[PDB]
Amino acid sequence: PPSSPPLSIMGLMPLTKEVAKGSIGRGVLPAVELAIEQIRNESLLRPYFLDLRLYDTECDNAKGLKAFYDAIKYGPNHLMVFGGVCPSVTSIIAESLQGWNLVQLSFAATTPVLADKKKYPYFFRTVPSDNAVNPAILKLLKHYQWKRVGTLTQDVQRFSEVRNDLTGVLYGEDIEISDTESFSNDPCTSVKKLKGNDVRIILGQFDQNMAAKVFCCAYEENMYGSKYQWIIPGWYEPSWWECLRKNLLAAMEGYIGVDFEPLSSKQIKTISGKTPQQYEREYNNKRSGVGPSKFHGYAYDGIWVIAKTLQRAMETLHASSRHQRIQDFNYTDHTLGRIILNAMNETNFFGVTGQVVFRNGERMGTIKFTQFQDSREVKVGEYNAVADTLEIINDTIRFQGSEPPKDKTIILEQLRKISLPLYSILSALTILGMIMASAFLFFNIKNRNQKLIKMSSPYMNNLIILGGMLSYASIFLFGLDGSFVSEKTFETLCTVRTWILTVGYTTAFGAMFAKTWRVHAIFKIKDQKLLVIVGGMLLIDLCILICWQAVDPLRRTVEKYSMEPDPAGRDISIRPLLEHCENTHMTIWLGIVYAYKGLLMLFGCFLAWETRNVSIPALNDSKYIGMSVYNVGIMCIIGAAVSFLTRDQPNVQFCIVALVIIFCSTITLCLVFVPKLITLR
Amino acid sequence: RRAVYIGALFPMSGGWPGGQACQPAVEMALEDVNSRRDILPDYELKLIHHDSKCDPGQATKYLYELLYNDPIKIILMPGCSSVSTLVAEAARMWNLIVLSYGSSSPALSNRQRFPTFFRTHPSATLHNPTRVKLFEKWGWKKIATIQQTTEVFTSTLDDLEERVKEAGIEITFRQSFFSDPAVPVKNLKRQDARIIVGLFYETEARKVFCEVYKERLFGKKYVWFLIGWYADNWFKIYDPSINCTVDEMTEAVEGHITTEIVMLNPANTRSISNMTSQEFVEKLTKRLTGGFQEAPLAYDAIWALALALNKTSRLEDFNYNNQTITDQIYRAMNSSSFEGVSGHVVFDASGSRMAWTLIEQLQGGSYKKIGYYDSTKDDLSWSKTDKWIGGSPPADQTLVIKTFRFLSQKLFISVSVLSSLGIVLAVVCLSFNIYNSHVRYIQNSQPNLNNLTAVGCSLALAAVFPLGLDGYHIGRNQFPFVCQARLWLLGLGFSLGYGSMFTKIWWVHTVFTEPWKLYATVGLLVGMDVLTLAIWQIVDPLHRTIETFAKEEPKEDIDVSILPQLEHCSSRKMNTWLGIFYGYKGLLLLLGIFLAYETKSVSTEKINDHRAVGMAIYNVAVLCLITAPVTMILSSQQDAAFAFASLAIVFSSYITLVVLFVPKMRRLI
Ligand SMILES: CC(C)CCC[C@@H](C)[C@H]1CC[C@H]2[C@@H]3CC=C4C[C@@H](O)CC[C@]4(C)[C@H]3CC[C@]12C
Ligand SMILES: CC(C)CCC[C@@H](C)[C@H]1CC[C@H]2[C@@H]3CC=C4C[C@@H](O)CC[C@]4(C)[C@H]3CC[C@]12C
Ligand SMILES: CC(C)CCC[C@@H](C)[C@H]1CC[C@H]2[C@@H]3CC=C4C[C@@H](O)CC[C@]4(C)[C@H]3CC[C@]12C
Ligand SMILES: CC(C)(C)c1cc(C(C)(C)C)c2c(c1)[C@@](O)(C(F)(F)F)C(=O)O2
């Protein structure tokens, strides 16, 4: 090529084979010269042709930096620089370019921090940092609908930045980030803080040699199974593991590693006219005994980029003078670098890695998801991101269980229910005393005409026992919730659940009061008098009933416990739930009625203090009444208190309310009317 | 008349545009010396400088102009810390020397990795052992940090970590960022922590706290440590790059804290150059608030340099490629040591020539002092000018106070009144019947036993006194002497009088369908109960025991959650042991009422006490039958078990013995 200058490339990388990274220093090059030879055979840049001046870096910043200076002073006017693999050198070089009107490109800046153009403007690259994995991860989570995460990193630049982007990308993307920690060197003082939440998911964005310590404490807290899936980068050295061997090997297996993709999977015609398989054949033929690269074809793509974007550049109106000012350029045409950058901001085409384009600097690229399937690593899927897609293949992945491990818990509701048999046991006892009630009916109504019938019009007493039965079968209505209930008309019964009680007790406790009141007020119409008395008593009854029932009187209020339940033996959570009902204001509408009936007792007990000076034994047994009254008085008040002070535990709330009533009604009434059978017999 | 060029690197913007005046300051120091003849017979120290901005890229450029197209140099004088960190690694591909005056990145003490570097600004590690002091003082133990992630700091913080692990302090959080500082603080507030350390630069910080006000991190429990070598007003100034005001940080940063280091010799001594800090400062002000505290290090540094040069002696006969002169002068500086403006100006790896520090607070508008300190003795001088909105240091976590559920002592007194009245009535009827203890309607009923009855009831009436009270300022130390007092007092009060009448009833079946057989029968009865007690009582006694409920959400104080606990004596097998006992005792009156069902309308005219006897007996029986399960079940609500508990007993006596002698009283008439 004699007509033109050799157009600038300033090449920077390892060259010796003293350093392990020195591998790369020569493990990539031959494909680079391969493309050079291709463009030699094609010669796009007619009238111009290309060339490169290689130098050493050694990734000790001094040597490479001096070498950079050296290639400056003792060389031609260069335009573009290629390379920068070791981090510390490139993070240096990046900012020195704004002073010389340069642009650079390279193929190892996984160091993400370079995204800030406001810091490092003139930089470009081809390889995707760890930053452009998060889109993939997001989409993965969507495709499994996992929606709760426990983040975890370790405090250095290169990872903390990843985290502080991920937090920024999930804005308006309906998943939370609950917990968080970090650490420097000792991780285990954190994983148990995390286990304290029993969370099901792990992100981990941390360097190689720490996984040992990580899982060594994990096993000692035992996070593994199905319920715990993990995410890690994939750029680790495969077979990286060389406190316990087998413990880990059993524990770890089944995670996800993730990283950049080396190459595509598809043999479509390229820009060159070639294919991946052709590429690697050309590769392995081009080498004999040198280690294999993985960040090479990206490089080749970049060289083709350099070519075509150069071509874009020289497609310029003032090509007349610029086709020489290539050559007389003295490191200082600011406009030129602006030209080049504006050019490449919209470069766009295909290569081995699919299309390759830029956004603020960064590649849109291709991704390797992998899983660790029983002592080896395997591909699992793929994520094109420029189209915001995904491809996953069956019969490849695996969990240790079978299902997507859900991310929260065995939450369960489990509406409590008082007394499995308590609907039955004591209710049958009620039926016992009830049939005794009907027995008293039979053996009472039999006689109906005898010396004892005139002692008392027994229809009054029939009414008493009527209210008895009513009050007495009220109980089962409290035997209601839990089973036999989803109707939501619970409020409907409760109205009845007091209506019945009120009436039965009221009437059947006024009757004998009025019996003896009549006996006195004659002695010191007869029967419809007492219907008048109770038709007035209805006014008190219904007036209080409906005043309570002003708005609703009954609001089904589900009350929630502490959700502190774990007793299933099934790894679940049951938020204990219960019910109740009030006038949705306060518990004031009750001492009213308790007082109303205490007044019945007392003014009825005016007859009692009469009886205490009456010469009772003529015809009746108010003595039999007084024991009853004191008994029931104290018992009812106790029930009234103990209920409201224990709306909480219902398991007994239904019992004690039974025992009070059953003792009251039965061992009052039954063993009071028994004398009226001793008489007959 | 010889002279030697120098290049050197300075600030004008960015992290520390303070050496604006140091540049003239060193010019002053320079023209000091060529005037003197003990300095150099021939050489006159020249200078070059360039602006850097503390942007290493532009600095790299100026460096390239310095070496590659610049005059022959030997030595360099840079500023901020990143830049030194660079050029040190850069040097040894020329075999230079270098010295910095400002930079404190501790990692540079690695003489091996960095052979040819010298400092005078001490390694900033000295900031730390200060800090632990306050962490030992105000009782703080759990912390979060953030930081910008340059080499200068990360190592500093890793040093912090161990320098408190010696004192077992915890670290439980970290963050990091480069220039988008927004999110990690948002991460912080959702890890709720109270304390903050920061370690960063100005033009970050303004942005930082600007954002911080938009998530409400200040005031009562949001304390911040920072750095002191900022300006004294850094936050007041216009930010062209945010959406904040002035007043918001003027109110939001309030309370924060700073530390820094004293550089000058605070004393008053003639210098080597016939100078002192006073006239020093005068000259600075003469040559021209920000960027001043730090200059003197030059006026020590270069003096030390030229002293090296009096030591050493060709000089213009130099090359980068040579190595020998560097080793000469490097041994020189390894040996170099004297006393100058700052103090005992000497070099080492610890960077701890100095020892004297500075604390500083901010209290509403500007910066102020609290005390000073020196680490060599752990000696802390204080001045007692602090402030907190609250009046005392908060503590990195809402602390839990473990109070007790009191027993509402305001009500205790009421039933105590009832107790006293019952006592009055008891002794009244007691001395009554024994006084007029001779009649037929009086002596023909054996009221001695009735007196016993009232007496036992008085004992169980005292039973309010011991057991109604723990959860107030009553004992707090010795419960068991009163705890067990419920038990002995009970039956000695209860079962005795209860059986005192039972004996009377026992005859109506056992006799009608003496009074030494009787008295000893009672002795057998009481002692039966008592020995069956003591087998469990003095063998298996109780003790004061504590129980607790769930944590709560008080919200009746500044910030502290409440964890109540309760207390009452019990042993580990009180499940059935205690209720079946109550049942045993109860069977007596169960049969007592059977005896009542017998002895109705059967007077027998011998003892004139059956009628309301049975009535009272029934009255008691129901109360016991009720109260046992109820105090059993309703124990976890300690507050009102007592409510029923003794009222029963009161409404026993006040409706038991009352009946006993009133007709007998009326029998007098
Ligand atoms: C004739 C008289 C003596 C009968 C009076 C009945 C009384 C004892 C009944 C009626 C209403 C009841 C109250 C209903 C509501 C409450 C509020 C609760 O937080 C404590 C119990 C308490 C305070 C109950 C105690 C017993 C009570 C006051
Ligand atoms: C038959 C008689 C003796 C029964 C009387 C019941 C009495 C003891 C009840 C009814 C109302 C109750 C009061 C309700 C309100 C208060 C105010 C509180 O700050 C102190 C307790 C105190 C003062 C209670 C003490 C006990 C109390 C007075
Ligand atoms: C016949 C007698 C014994 C029955 C007396 C019923 C008593 C035990 C009832 C009626 C009113 C009730 C009180 C209602 C209000 C309060 C205030 C609360 O902050 C503590 C409970 C307390 C103090 C209750 C305890 C039980 C109580 C005192
Ligand atoms: C305990 C005692 C006071 C002796 C008593 C108990 C009863 C019960 C039926 C409740 C067991 C009783 C009476 C007295 C009566 O004489 C009456 F007066 F109450 F009528 C009666 O027959 O019933």
> Closest Cα to residue A507, out of A475, A569, A547, A460?
A460
Question: What is d(CA B483, CA B491) in angstroms, rounded to the nearest whole number?
Answer: 15
Q: How many domains does chain A have?
A: 3
Looking at the fold, whether A189 and A158 belong to one and the same domain comes out as: yes
Ligand 4 mutation target, pool B588, B595, B618, B623, most atoms within 8 A of CB: B618
Q: How many CB atoms lie within 10 A of CB B282?
A: 10
Q: What length does chain A have?
A: 681
Looking at the fold, whether B470 and B594 belong to one and the same domain comes out as: yes
Q: How far is CA A392 from CA A146, A254, A370, A386, A555, in A?
A: 16, 16, 11, 17, 53
CATH of the domain at A185: 3.40.50.2300
**Is the CB of residue B33 below 6 angstroms from any atom belonging to ligand 4?**
no
Looking at the fold, whether A172 and A53 belong to one and the same domain comes out as: no
Which atom number of ligand 2 is nearest to the Cα of residue B418?
Answer: 3
- Strands laid side by side in the B257-261 sheet: B195-197, B223-225, B257-261, B357-362, B367-368
- Residue B507: which H helix or E strand, with range? helix B485-510
- Do the strands A229-233 and A201-203 form a parallel or antiparallel pair, or are they unpaired? parallel
Around ligand 1, the residues with Cβ closer than 6 Å are A 587, 590-591, 594, 598, 637, 640-641, 644-645
B168 touching A, CB under 8 A?
no
Q: Are B90 and B68 in contact (CB under 8 A)?
A: no
CA of B618, nearest ligand number: 4
> Closest Cα to residue B537, out of B485, B461, B477?
B485
Looking at the fold, whether B178 and B115 belong to one and the same domain comes out as: no
Question: What is d(CA A140, CA A389) in angstroms, rounded to the nearest whole number?
Answer: 10
Q: Identify the domain boundary among A260, A294, A324.
A: A260
Residue B620: closest CA among chain A residues belongs to which residue?
Answer: A631
Give Cα B470 distance to the centre of its chain.
Answer: 29
Can you say which residues of B are annotated as belonging to the binding site for phaclofen?
81, 104, 121, 294
The DSSP result for B443-472, as a single string, is TTT-THHHHHHHHHHHHHHHTHHHHT-SSS
CATH of the domain at B60: 3.40.50.2300
Domain membership flag for residue A336: yes
**Cβ neighbours of B91 in A, within 8 Å:** 62
**Is the CB of residue B612 below 6 angstroms from any atom belonging to ligand 4?**
no
Expressed in angstroms and rounded, the spacing between residue B512 Cα and the centre of ligand 4 is 20
Residues with Cβ within 8 Å of A677's Cβ and at least 6 positions away in sequence, in order, are: A443
Asked whether the beta carbons of residue A161 and residue B177 sit closer than 8 angstroms, the reply is yes
Question: B285 to chain A, minimum CA–CA distance in Å?
Answer: 35
Residues with Cβ within 8 Å of A315's Cβ and at least 6 positions away in sequence, in order, are: none
Q: Are A471 and A433 in contact (CB under 8 A)?
A: no
Residues with Cβ within 8 Å of A261's Cβ and at least 6 positions away in sequence, in order, are: A353, A365, A366, A367, A368, A382
Question: What is d(CA A68, CA A55) in angstroms, rounded to the nearest whole number?
Answer: 8
The SS3 assignment for A167 reads helix
Q: Which two tokens stand for residue B416?
A: 């105590």
Question: What is d(CA A64, CA A72) in angstroms, rounded to the nearest whole number?
Answer: 12
Residue in A69, A96, A634 nearest the CB of B622: A634
Looking at the fold, whether A451 and A536 belong to one and the same domain comes out as: yes
**Alpha-carbon torsion (A659, A661, A666, A669), positive or negative:** positive
Domain membership flag for residue A79: yes
A180 touching B, CB under 8 A?
yes
Domain membership flag for residue B196: yes
Looking at the fold, whether B166 and B256 belong to one and the same domain comes out as: yes
B655 touching A, CB under 8 A?
no
Q: Where are the beta strands (DSSP E) in B200-311?
A: 223-225, 257-261
Can you say which residues of B are annotated as belonging to the binding site for 4-aminobutanoate?
81, 104, 121, 201, 294
Domain membership flag for residue A599: yes
Residue A116: closest CA among chain B residues belongs to which residue?
Answer: B179
Question: What is d(CA A616, CA A635) in angstroms, rounded to the nearest whole number?
Answer: 26
Question: What is d(CA B149, CA A156) in angstroms, rounded to the nearest whole number?
Answer: 7
Question: What is d(CA A291, CA A288) in angstroms, rounded to the nearest whole number?
Answer: 9
Around ligand 3, the residues with Cβ closer than 6 Å are A 641; B 639-640, 643-644, 647, 651
Q: Are A392 and A268 in contact (CB under 8 A)?
A: no
Q: Are B100 and B74 in contact (CB under 8 A)?
A: no
The identity of residue A618, as a single letter, is A
Residues with Cβ within 8 Å of B640's Cβ and at least 6 positions away in sequence, in order, are: A645, B634
Domain membership flag for residue B370: no
Given resolution (angstroms): 4.5
Residues with Cβ within 8 Å of B167's Cβ and at least 6 positions away in sequence, in order, are: B132, B135, B136
**Alpha-carbon torsion (A22, A28, A33, A39), positive or negative:** negative
Domain membership flag for residue A118: yes
Residues with Cβ within 8 Å of A227's Cβ and at least 6 positions away in sequence, in order, are: A200, A405, A406
Expressed in angstroms and rounded, the spacing between residue A591 Cα and the centre of ligand 1 is 7
B-interface mutation test, from A102, A116, A134, A184, most B Cβ less than 10 A away: A184
Looking at the fold, whether B482 and B432 belong to one and the same domain comes out as: yes
Looking at the fold, whether A92 and A150 belong to one and the same domain comes out as: no
Q: How many domains does chain B have?
A: 3
Looking at the fold, whether B221 and B310 belong to one and the same domain comes out as: no
Question: What is d(CA A383, CA A392) in angstroms, rounded to the nearest whole number?
Answer: 8
Note every long-range contact of A274-282, with CB atoms under 8 Å and residues 24 or more positions apart, other chains counting. A276/A352, A279/A31, A279/A352, A282/A31, A282/A34
Asked whether the beta carbons of residue A62 and residue B89 sit closer than 8 angstroms, the reply is yes
Domain membership flag for residue B341: no
A-interface mutation test, from B176, B211, B321, most A Cβ less than 10 A away: B176
**Is the CB of residue A675 below 6 angstroms from any atom belonging to ligand 4?**
no
- Which single residue is written with the structure tokens 């006799």? B511
- Strands laid side by side in the B75-77 sheet: B50-51, B7-10, B75-77, B97-99, B117-118
Looking at the fold, whether A600 and A494 belong to one and the same domain comes out as: yes
Torsion from C-alpha of B54, B60, B61, B66, nearest 10 degrees: 100
Domain membership flag for residue A579: no
| Residue A156 lies in domain | 131-260
Looking at the fold, whether A145 and A167 belong to one and the same domain comes out as: yes
Residues closing a segment before a gap in chain B (C–N exceeding 2.5 Å): 288, 313, 513
**Is the CB of residue B517 below 6 angstroms from any atom belonging to ligand 4?**
no
> Closest Cα to residue A628, out of B648, B659, B590, B618?
B618
Question: What is d(CA A285, CA A296) in angstroms, rounded to the nearest whole number?
Answer: 15
Burial (CB count within 10 angstroms: exposed 0-12, middle 13-18, buried 19+), residue B153: buried
Asked whether the beta carbons of residue B60 and residue A96 sit closer than 8 angstroms, the reply is yes
Looking at the fold, whether A338 and A193 belong to one and the same domain comes out as: no
Looking at the fold, whether A294 and A207 belong to one and the same domain comes out as: no
Give Cα B68 distance to the centre of its chain.
Answer: 60
Domain membership flag for residue B277: no
The SS3 assignment for B547 reads strand
Domain membership flag for residue A416: no
- Which single residue is written with the structure tokens 């350099």? A306
Domain membership flag for residue B282: no
Residues with Cβ within 8 Å of B540's Cβ and at least 6 positions away in sequence, in order, are: B571
Looking at the fold, whether B422 and B501 belong to one and the same domain comes out as: yes
Domain membership flag for residue B339: no
| Residue B243 lies in domain | 125-261
Q: Which B residues 616-635 touch A at CB under 8 Å?
A: 618-619, 622, 626, 630, 633-634
> Closest Cα to residue A3, out of A43, A63, A59?
A43
Domain membership flag for residue A199: yes
Question: What is d(CA B60, CA B53) in angstroms, rounded to the nearest whole number?
Answer: 11
Question: A666 to chain B, minimum CA–CA distance in Å?
Answer: 16
Residue in B64, B154, B630 nearest the CB of A69: B64
Q: Are B220 and B390 in contact (CB under 8 A)?
A: yes
- Which single residue is written with the structure tokens 């384009």? A357
Looking at the fold, whether B575 and B599 belong to one and the same domain comes out as: yes
Looking at the fold, whether B116 and B167 belong to one and the same domain comes out as: no
Looking at the fold, whether B180 and B244 belong to one and the same domain comes out as: yes
Q: Reduce the secondary structure of A253-285 to three states and give it as a string.
A: CCCEEEEECCCCCCCCCCCCCCCHHHHHHHHHH
Q: How far is CA B259 from CA A611, B138, B159, B354, B610, in A?
A: 94, 17, 17, 15, 92
Q: Which two tokens stand for residue B159?
A: 């040093």
Residue in A65, A180, A181 nearest the CB of B90: A65
Ligand 2 mutation target, pool B407, B408, B409, B411, most atoms within 8 A of CB: B411
B593 phi and psi, to 5 degrees? Answer: -75, -30
- Do the strands A10-13 and A53-56 form a parallel or antiparallel pair, or are they unpaired? parallel
Residue B170: closest CA among chain A residues belongs to which residue?
Answer: A189
Q: Identify the domain boundary among A228, A260, A292.
A: A260
Question: What is d(CA A153, CA A231) in angstroms, rounded to the nearest whole number?
Answer: 11
B628 phi and psi, to 5 degrees? Answer: -60, -60
Looking at the fold, whether B110 and B137 belong to one and the same domain comes out as: no
- Residue A87: which H helix or E strand, with range? helix A87-93
- Residue A382: which H helix or E strand, with range? strand A377-382
> Closest Cα to residue B303, out of B270, B338, B330?
B338
Q: How far is CA B637 from CA B459, B531, B559, B632, in A?
A: 26, 32, 27, 11
A182 touching B, CB under 8 A?
yes
Looking at the fold, whether A455 and A594 belong to one and the same domain comes out as: yes
Q: Which two tokens stand for residue B371?
A: 């005390």
Looking at the fold, whether A163 and A228 belong to one and the same domain comes out as: yes
B154 touching A, CB under 8 A?
yes
Ligand 4 mutation target, pool A611, A627, A671, most atoms within 8 A of CB: A627
- Do the strands B367-368 and B357-362 form a parallel or antiparallel pair, or are they unpaired? antiparallel
Looking at the fold, whether B30 and B154 belong to one and the same domain comes out as: no
Domain membership flag for residue A205: yes
Domain membership flag for residue B267: no
Question: What is d(CA B68, CA B200) in angstroms, rounded to the nearest whole number?
Answer: 34
Q: Are B639 and A651 in contact (CB under 8 A)?
A: no
Question: What is d(CA B143, CA A245) in angstroms, rounded to the nearest whole number?
Answer: 35
Q: Identify the domain boundary among A198, A231, A260.
A: A260
Question: What is d(CA B237, CA B569) in angstroms, rounded to the nearest whole number?
Answer: 67
Residue in B174, B178, B633 nearest the CB of A113: B178
Domain membership flag for residue B434: yes
Question: What is d(CA B341, CA B73) in angstroms, rounded to the nearest whole number?
Answer: 27
Angle between helices A622-644 and A650-673 (to 10 degrees): 180
**Cβ neighbours of B183 in A, within 8 Å:** 164, 167-168
- Which single residue is written with the structure tokens 């800046």? A109
Q: Identify the domain boundary among B210, B244, B261.
A: B261
**Alpha-carbon torsion (B333, B337, B340, B345), positive or negative:** positive
**Cβ neighbours of B182 in A, within 8 Å:** 168
Question: What is d(CA B504, CA B521) in angstroms, rounded to the nearest whole number?
Answer: 11
Looking at the fold, whether B135 and B58 belong to one and the same domain comes out as: no
> Closest Cα to residue A148, out of A200, A222, A205, A225?
A200
Looking at the fold, whether A166 and A278 belong to one and the same domain comes out as: no
Q: How far is CA A116 from CA A95, A122, B179, in A?
A: 11, 10, 8
Q: Running DSSP on this structure, what letter comes out for residue A608?
A: H
- Residue A500: which H helix or E strand, with range? helix A490-523
Q: Which A residues 33-62 touch B at CB under 8 Å?
A: 60-62
Residues with Cβ within 8 Å of B331's Cβ and at least 6 positions away in sequence, in order, are: none
- Experimental technique for the deposited model: cryo-EM
Q: Which A residues 95-114 touch B at CB under 8 Å?
A: 95-100, 113
Torsion from C-alpha of A27, A33, A35, A41, nearest 10 degrees: -160
Residue A170: closest CA among chain B residues belongs to which residue?
Answer: B183
Q: Are A125 and A109 in contact (CB under 8 A)?
A: yes
Expressed in angstroms and rounded, the spacing between residue B619 Cα and the centre of ligand 3 is 21
Q: Running DSSP on this structure, what letter comes out for residue B123?
A: P
Looking at the fold, whether A196 and A278 belong to one and the same domain comes out as: no
Residue A89: closest CA among chain B residues belongs to which residue?
Answer: B86
Burial (CB count within 10 angstroms: exposed 0-12, middle 13-18, buried 19+), residue A261: buried
Asked whether the beta carbons of residue B55 and residue A95 sit closer than 8 angstroms, the reply is yes
> Closest Cα to residue A371, out of A230, A219, A199?
A230
Prior bond to A47 cis, omega within 30?
yes
Q: Are B152 and B81 in contact (CB under 8 A)?
A: yes
